[PDB]
Amino acid sequence: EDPQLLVRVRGGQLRGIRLKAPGGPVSAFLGIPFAEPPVGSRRFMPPEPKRPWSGVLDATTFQNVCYQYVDTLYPGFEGTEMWNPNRELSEDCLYLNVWTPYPRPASPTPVLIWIYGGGFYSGAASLDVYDGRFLAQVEGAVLVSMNYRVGTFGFLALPGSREAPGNVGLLDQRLALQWVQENIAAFGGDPMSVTLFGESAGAASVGMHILSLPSRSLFHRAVLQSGTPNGPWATVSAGEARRRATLLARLVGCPNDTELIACLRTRPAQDLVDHEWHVLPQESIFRFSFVPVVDGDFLSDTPEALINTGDFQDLQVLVGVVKDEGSYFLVYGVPGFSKDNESLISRAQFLAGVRIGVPQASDLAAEAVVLHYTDWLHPEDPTHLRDAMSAVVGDHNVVCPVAQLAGRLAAQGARVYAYIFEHRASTLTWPLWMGVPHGYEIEFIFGLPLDPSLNYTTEERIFAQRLMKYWTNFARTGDPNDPRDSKSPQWPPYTTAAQQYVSLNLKPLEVRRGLRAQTCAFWNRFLPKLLSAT
Amino acid sequence: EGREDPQLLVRVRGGQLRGIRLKAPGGPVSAFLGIPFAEPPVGSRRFMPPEPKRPWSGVLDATTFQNVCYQYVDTLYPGFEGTEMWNPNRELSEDCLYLNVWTPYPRPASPTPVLIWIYGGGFYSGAASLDVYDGRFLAQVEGAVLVSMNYRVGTFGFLALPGSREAPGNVGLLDQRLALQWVQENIAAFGGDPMSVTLFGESAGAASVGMHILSLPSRSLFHRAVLQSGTPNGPWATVSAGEARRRATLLARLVGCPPNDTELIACLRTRPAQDLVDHEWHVLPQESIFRFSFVPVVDGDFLSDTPEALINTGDFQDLQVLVGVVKDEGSYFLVYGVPGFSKDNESLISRAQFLAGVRIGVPQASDLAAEAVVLHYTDWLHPEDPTHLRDAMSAVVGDHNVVCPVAQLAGRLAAQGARVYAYIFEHRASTLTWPLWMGVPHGYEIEFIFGLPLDPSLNYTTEERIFAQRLMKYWTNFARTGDPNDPRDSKSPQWPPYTTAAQQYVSLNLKPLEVRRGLRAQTCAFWNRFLPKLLSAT
Ligand SMILES: Nc1ccc2c(c1)c(-c1ccccc1)[n+](CCCCCc1cn(CCNc3c4c(nc5ccccc35)CCCC4)nn1)c1cc(N)ccc21
Ligand SMILES: Nc1ccc2c(c1)c(-c1ccccc1)[n+](CCCCCc1cn(CCNc3c4c(nc5ccccc35)CCCC4)nn1)c1cc(N)ccc21
Ligand SMILES: *[C@@H]1O[C@H](CO)[C@@H](O)[C@H](O)[C@H]1NC(C)=O
Ligand SMILES: *[C@@H]1O[C@H](CO)[C@@H](O)[C@H](O)[C@H]1NC(C)=O
Ligand SMILES: *[C@@H]1O[C@H](CO)[C@@H](O)[C@H](O)[C@H]1NC(C)=O
Ligand SMILES: *[C@@H]1O[C@H](CO)[C@@H](O)[C@H](O)[C@H]1NC(C)=O
């Protein structure tokens, strides 16, 4: 036996695996149970801490992926399959992973906790792009990722009930955060320096931990990559969650909350998944059926209310977006869009797309979107219309909620750093029109280009190394700038006055001002006044 | 006669005229000033359509400018050239229906294209006798026959009680039409081609030119048109029959006239001209800028429907139009009503002053519509910057009232068969006395088109004299051929026609022609497509 692979955590002993990273070994502890399997009577219920075990628990393999819908849009295509589960689907999925340097850090090391995305309906901490071996090896970081319940299983709520209260997927995350406080020092991690980081629904989850007091004592810093707690898709009202749960219950033949939930618990997992998509109020894109609910418990008020009134004085936040946030969403529901053609659309297809892309918009509000995004010099140009459609979806759902979050946190005492990731991976198999799509920065931050077998360019390996340094410098100090590098250009904090952000690309840092300032003034200030007054 | 200069004796349908040999920088010109074209619209004739001038006996002396139509005299900045250059330069009288004619000296042997000037001044002011409307340069240098007429302004020209016989409205436009009919009958007596008449005007003059395009009985009296910083469509050029009835009834009330239309109009006719002027400004529905009390009315007669309806449905196939704007259309309007603005300070305003200004600048806007304007014109990087706010305020007024109505007109005419040429005049006169922040204000291209820099006594630069010469060539080539380009000078940048596809227009400045695309395309999509929908719905 290897003493570097033997760890005693409060629940008992574990045996990890020595893994080979490009520059040397790492110790990986995969499939650690952090909760009692949320099966049977415990379906839809908050997680319970995992009971202690006997002997040495084998923590050398990733555990099951939470029950979720498997994407079959483009079957066998690397572009879609890379996001699809890579372990067996099971309701017994509440396990976490830990990567540490080999040997175990001599002094307490800053901890980075990854919370995956997938619209709160999908994802796993076991996907290749979330591999913590590089950050652990190269930057000496203790990296943790956990599985949390997604879909009906994690977010089906009958608000006010005790059996299905909602937000249980976020409670699974909170329990993995409590686990880290209690056990990370056994791995050489500093429980007093925990940075949460996530992308898309993961970033929204990070934001929801900022906005929920019981989570606030479990971390010190936060990274929100292409996602926010505020916005059109991250939350639903208690009413809308009640509507959706009652409809899915009807669809699966379930005729009192206790009675309804009891019946939902008798249904096989796949039956719930099979009907999940049928509860959305309109034909839409960037909208998910079971997402966090504004319950007045985990979320005391709507994220908008909480970000506008919160005190963020002793907080550091790294936020940002990718060049083309909304591009991939178009092939999943907008007529005229495909990965296999240049997707040059007509004006009619653009107006049609805006109603799907902004499903909550009135006729006047949709006209306001169309008139803002049209290039009145080339209003019929298919390339301009195709690119405008991507912008509507990315701006509405990601860029402008990020700009609003950065603005409110900065105004209310937080230390904020903002970025725009603009490098398209050389290895990308999605069409060129999709640009830098939502989620394709993750592989750089995690340092995948550093594996020569993955065939990224030399420039991409240097760029990934740079990104890993920003993220780990941020986790260490709350500032992404290298205290060693006495050379320019420094990454300035984002402020309400100067609105500074940086470009993350192959070229050195470039400081820009105003994150789509005019367009986001449209989404964040005008459009609410339009759906408000009428 | 017999001892007189034979080149100054001309007969017209009404009788004999004696003109005057004027001096232009490059030689003499013939001028026939103060020719009567109508029966004085006085007494019982006040508010009534003009009647053609009855013939006279003897030789009428046409050597001096005649009376300016009764109007409000501006006393904003008294003594200041900037305001006094626009103020009447002859006696104010209700007897003002006279026209002027400048022709080469000696008069052309062959029929010459005719240019007819229609002055601006919000339909409340103006005269064809102002120094900037001097036809002596265009006549001398370009051999043109230039005509300008006085038309009734204010209550006198545009007070209407729609449906009445006594005050039908648009009589100021009928005075213009009568001067157009006079040109058809008599211009050949001066060497002018009645078959090649180009109307040109600025501001309310340009709106009047547009109203002659949109009114069938005028269409047979001209062949081409120039609309400088003004249009028939837009927020200020017309009023509804209801709004005109409201305003006429209110002014009647204000001057002690109890409201029957016959009875009310009869009383208005007994009131001294100055009493009507003294109360003219008191009938505007809101605190506003770029809004005038008595303007053309959509009567279902001179204007068969609203100018918007007429420009959207009209066939403009055999029509050549030259349109354009100045760099800073709305700047001067700010000192005439927006708190925080003065010609005497740099006018750096606050956000509160900007929001306040938008309500004055867009008086017909709802709370939501005004918010849409504020959010569009704010620089979300520097939303408190006084220079940006001052400049945004000028842009709101200029765009709303001039730039975007011009863009809409150019678009509709081009789409419906017309040959449109569009420009942006960007040269600030070296002689300008308004502050630098005002840029190139509304009306300050006129002196260049008329060729005033050509007079050495006016102290313009050599570059400005070459530039004026260039402009006079564009306008007169346009009047001659319907194309501002010189077919001889093929090297010089070509002025392309404005089309709906390419949206081309040129920069008129000291530098050679530069072709640009889209006349403030995004912002005007806001004013012309969005904001009306913010009235059709909420
Ligand atoms: N079977 C069924 C029945 C009914 C419906 C649907 C499916 C679907 C649907 C869902 C998923 C895949 C394909 C189709 N939608 C479409 C809505 C979901 C599309 C949004 C979406 C799809 N995905 C795929 C997840 N994988 C990705 C993820 C990321 N990046 C990616 C980049 C490229 C491609 C995939 C990526 C970053 C974060 C991790 C997840 N992520 N978000 C509906 C919308 C309605 N209005 C009504 C009914 C249905
Ligand atoms: N006595 C009194 C009583 C009440 C009111 C007013 C006056 C005035 C007012 C009118 C003229 C000068 C000073 C003040 N306005 C303001 C009217 C705004 C008119 C804007 C305007 C002013 N002028 C002057 C005409 N001369 C000019 C002309 C042009 N350019 C110019 C450039 C700079 C300066 C003058 C120019 C283009 C050519 C035609 C005339 N032309 N348009 C009101 C607006 C209300 N809402 C209500 C009440 C009043
Ligand atoms: C792209 O392909 C899909 C079918 O594969 C089709 O519906 C769509 O019209 C195509 N677009 C173009 C531009 O041909
Ligand atoms: C890298 O390229 C080589 C061919 O040069 C190929 O054999 C290998 O499988 C590639 N790997 C990936 C992951 O693309
Ligand atoms: C300009 O002067 C006027 C009064 O003459 C005043 O109302 C305005 O506030 C002043 N503006 C500035 C910028 O000083
Ligand atoms: C022109 O300049 C002279 C000074 O050389 C001056 O006396 C005269 O008043 C000026 N006239 C005008 C119109 O500016």
Swiss-Prot record, chain B:
Biological processes annotated in GO: acetylcholine catabolic process; acetylcholine receptor signaling pathway; cell adhesion; osteoblast development; positive regulation of cold-induced thermogenesis; receptor internalization; regulation of receptor recycling; retina development in camera-type eye
Compartment list: Synapse; Secreted; Cell membrane
Catalytic center residues: 203 (acyl-ester intermediate), 329 (charge relay system), 442 (charge relay system)
One of the record's GO molecular function terms: collagen binding
Taxonomic superkingdom: Eukaryota
Tissue and organ expression note: Predominates in most expressing tissues except erythrocytes where a glycophospholipid-attached form of ACHE predominates.
InterPro entries, per database record: AB_hydrolase_fold, AChE-related_enzymes, AChE_tetra, CarbesteraseB, Carboxylesterase_B_AS, Carboxylesterase_B_CS, Cholinesterase
Covalent S-S links between cysteines: 69-96, 257-267, 404-524
Annotated catalysed reactions: acetylcholine + H2O = choline + acetate + H(+)
UniProt entry keywords in alphabetical sequence: Cell membrane, Disulfide bond, Glycoprotein, GPI-anchor, Hydrolase, Lipoprotein, Membrane, Neurotransmitter degradation, Secreted, Serine esterase, Signal, Synapse
Function comment: Terminates signal transduction at the neuromuscular junction by rapid hydrolysis of the acetylcholine released into the synaptic cleft.
Protein name as annotated: Acetylcholinesterase
Organism: Mus musculus (Mouse)
The gene coding this protein: Ache
